[model samples]
Target: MALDGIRMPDGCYADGTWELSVHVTDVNRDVTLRVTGEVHIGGVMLKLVEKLDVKKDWSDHALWWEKKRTWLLKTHWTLDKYGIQADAKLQFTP
Candidate 1:
């Protein structure tokens, strides 16, 4: 199954947004949110793209994807803004 260019690995069932598991401090936090195609980095945390441009650097952070084993300079950019789609297995590290 596929949605918004995000393909579900076989046997996975989804209806648009996929379950995103975020790991921080070696612990996991599950978030059932949709990637509006955008991302934000601030407050020393990586968060889903939102409209909160209050005293943020907007240009000093990295977005890492575990499955892909890649890093991105995602500042003021969306997931789609960098060829990333939903159902992405990602993580943020400092």
Candidate 2:
């Protein structure tokens, strides 16, 4: 589905919930973050770090960033509250 020129991934919101794809990167590492709308950005970040198993502490060394806008994510906001819908891409950086 397409909304406001953004194309959502297939099967998105099929169960009355939104799923998003966030592309995260830091230094030479990159990963795609898949999550649901009910989760907060902070939770998403933690999940990303856990998936990567980075040697450093994320809170002290990393931050979630948006690719297109090149802005840091607001950790306190839920993905839905941040208007993050399906197929949205974000980044994790130091």
Candidate 3:
């Protein structure tokens, strides 16, 4: 287990999670999700669902990036495809 990693790579870790931020109406905090290439960012919300305190539900919430001002669907695309990197700031609109 001495030499277990390498560089010259990109995108989220396929085996680990990334801590990111989500902004809602009255709450803003850091959340974490798995960096899976097989799943879309909407699955990300579920991974983030990791959230139920809002009662807004991640189902219809508009997940977007404030930095790029783009939107995310519930089940179609991956985060990296949208140029979303670590410290990704997303917003959930009701």
- Specify the highest-lDDT model's number: 3
**Which stretches of candidate 3 lie above 4 Å from their native place?**
1-17, 26-39, 53-55
Lowest summed-lDDT stretch of 10 residues in model 2?
A: 4-13
In order, what lDDT does every prediction score?
A: 0.44, 0.60, 0.61
Candidate that would win on TM-score: 2
Candidate 1 at 90: error in angstroms? 0.8
Ranking by TM-score: 2, 3, 1
- RMSD for each model, in Å, please? 8.5, 7.5, 4.8
Screening candidate 3 with a backbone cut-off below 3 angstroms (N, C-alpha, C), the clashing residue pairs are none
Stretches > 4 Å off in candidate 2: 1-13, 24-28, 61-74
Candidate 3 shows a clash count of: 0
Residue by residue across 1-94, what tens digits does model 3's lDDT show? 4444443233334535455566663356445454544457777777666545554467776665688766787465577676566667777655
What would the per-residue lDDT of candidate 1 be over residues 12-33, giving only the tens digit for each residue?
5445443343432233542233
Work out the TM-score per prediction: 0.41, 0.60, 0.58
- Pairs with steric clashes in candidate 1: 38-78
In terms of lDDT, model 1 sits at 0.44
